[PDB]
């Protein structure tokens, strides 16, 4: 039983429901080739200057990722393609609104580009959020997913190069005795394609067996605005922020947020008023 | 059966365990009279110029609070007593650290001064966070509290003036069939005393029957860093922020946060580094 593939331009409303039922979906041509090329181009140097995850020079080192992994987050300052095309993607927003309607507003928990070097070993099967948000493990099983992850291929995902393994239907599992690599299916994708999974979906990066190929992806974790993000955009220059759309500003934490409660009082408010209104924050102002 | 009253200076380790078991506790002399006096002095103007909760001039109106209540949050820039004495209170930090060890770092969800005018009606029994964080409702019942509320009396709490009603043991309730004002006990307090309750504790503001007395309190909601705060400190002048201690900076969202996960990757980080290191934020620098 393989992962469901859906069109990003045709069968839309079918994406979230599909992931909901199966826990994983592949969205063909989520990003266009032109968009991928610009992103690749823009982040290229930052990826080459990124040290190992657990570098000693970091005060918040990542001890979970392998030494052959380079992860670059806080992409709004680095790339125009990400902060304009990606953050405003209509397909992403429709999927998110469908997924998080019961909770309310959603934002970016993390936007990052990941590069796996040649001979990168396979990760152990896991679920996202366990190393940052312990609260998630205390949610009731029928609770709707609080975060989802868009895994966009910036390069080819093949069996030989480490394409993502996924266990279909495991987002609903309560007993984890059944977890094994034998229950997984692969996510073979071309650049621009995206694998969508919920925070409860068991999966893992594959093993790179060629010794040649380098795999890159853009990982976008979207979550309800009630959860603190992994990355911060506080230090992003005002001009950049003021250059984005109000929607993008909100996803980045530069706006107040709302919940689904009928008489919602809001998040990140300032004495009854929004962050943006208090600060008279401009939007869509070019550099 | 009345609310347990504990000393803030002696029986310190008994406060959290007491609240955990009973859902509420009075902490006598949580703030000293000098601190209270300064706080009152400092926020007095902002309380008098505050409009009704659902003022039409606000973009994030509060339709739940009554029209005779004035609520003023984002207190760091207004008061030195709050931002220095209160945010650094040793009692508060020992309580929070004991409450939230399971989850990790905690911060301020909201710091607010509340004033109730004469003849303020009694609120309906309720639980906090329902109009802002719908996620809380999907937590398993054995999940440790994700937020707690310090209700500090800035004026006297009497039966006649509207002192807070609480239903002891109601934080462990799954069935809300027997919720009634008849199950409640009062929190009679002198200025500086604090009523501590969990997010699951059923309570309500009392009715002020004198027609003359005004009741004021400082409400402080402390929650795990994994939940988004209700108030934002983004627009607080940097000098002010750079004036606080590092701990206070963290409680205000002007620092990166950590969780209890063994190989924690952190929250609000910037490419492996903290907000404070990235921005080279100064601390304890007088105005
Ligand atoms: C730690 N971590 C991340 O760094 C991360 C990286 C990109 C996008 C989301 C993301 N969120 C997480 O919770 C997370 C899970 C995770 C990664 C690797 C392994 C290993 F085991 F394989 F190593 C286990 C678990
Ligand atoms: C809306 N609300 C607050 O404004 C608030 C105000 C100060 C400190 C925490 C706090 N947390 C909440 O989610 C909340 C609960 C709440 C207040 C009044 C009533 C009424 F109904 F009684 F009014 C009901 C519910
Ligand atoms: Fe993962
Ligand atoms: Fe309340």
Swiss-Prot record, chains A, B:
It catalyses: (-)-4'-methoxycyclopeptine + 2-oxoglutarate + O2 = (Z)-4'-methoxydehydrocyclopeptine + succinate + CO2 + H2O; (Z)-4'-methoxydehydrocyclopeptine + 2-oxoglutarate + O2 = (-)-4'-methoxycyclopenine + succinate + CO2; (-)-cyclopeptine + 2-oxoglutarate + O2 = (Z)-dehydrocyclopeptine + succinate + CO2 + H2O; (Z)-dehydrocyclopeptine + 2-oxoglutarate + O2 = (-)-cyclopenine + succinate + CO2. Keywords: Dioxygenase, Iron, Metal-binding, Oxidoreductase. Pathway: Secondary metabolite biosynthesis; Alkaloid biosynthesis; Mycotoxin biosynthesis. Fe cation binds at residues 126, 128, 203. Its cofactor is Fe cation. Iron/alpha-ketoglutarate-dependent dioxygenase; part of the gene cluster that mediates the biosynthesis of the aspoquinolone mycotoxins. Within the pathway, the iron/alpha-ketoglutarate-dependent dioxygenase asqJ acts as a (-)-cyclopenine synthase that converts 4'-methoxycyclopeptin into 4'-methoxydehydrocyclopeptin through dehydrogenation to form a double bond between C-alpha and C-beta of the O-methyltyrosine side chain. Homodimer. This is Iron/alpha-ketoglutarate-dependent dioxygenase asqJ. It comes from Emericella nidulans (strain FGSC A4 / ATCC 38163 / CBS 112.46 / NRRL 194 / M139) (Aspergillus nidulans).
């Amino acid at each position: 039983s393989q992962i469901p593939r859906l069109s990003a331009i045709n069968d839309l409303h079918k994406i979230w429901p599909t992931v909901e039922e199966h826990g994983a979906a592949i969205i063909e041509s989520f990003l266009s080739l032109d968009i991928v090329r610009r992103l690749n181009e823009e982040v290229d140097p930052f990826v080459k200057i990124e040290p190992i995850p657990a570098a000693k020079t970091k005060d918040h080192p990542n001890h979970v990722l392998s030494t052959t992994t380079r992860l670059v987050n806080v992409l709004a300052p680095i790339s125009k393609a990400y902060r304009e095309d990606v953050l405003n993607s209509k397909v992403l927003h429709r999927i998110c609104s469908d997924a998080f309607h019961v909770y309310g507003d959603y934002w970016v928990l993390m936007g990052a580009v990941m590069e796996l070097a040649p001979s990168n070993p396979a990760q152990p099967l896991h679920r996202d959020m366990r190393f940052s948000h312990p609260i998630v493990e205390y949610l009731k099983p029928d609770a709707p997913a609080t975060s989802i992850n868009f895994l966009v291929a910036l390069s080819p995902f093949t069996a030989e190069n480490g394409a993502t393994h996924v266990i279909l239907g495991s987002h609903k599992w309560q007993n984890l005795s059944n977890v094994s690599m034998d229950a997984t299916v692969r996510a073979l994708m071309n650049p621009g394609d995206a694998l969508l999974i919920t925070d409860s979906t068991i999966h893992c990066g594959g093993a790179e067996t060629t010794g040649t190929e380098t795999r890159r992806l853009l990982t976008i974790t979207m979550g309800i605005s009630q959860l603190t993000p992994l990355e911060s955009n506080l230090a992003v220059p005002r001009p950049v922020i003021e250059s984005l759309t109000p929607l993008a500003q909100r996803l980045l934490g530069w706006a107040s947020q709302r919940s689904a409660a009928p008489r919602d009082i809001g998040l990140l408010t300032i004495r009854g008023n929004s962050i943006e209104k208090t600060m008279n924050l401009k939007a869509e102002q070019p550099l």
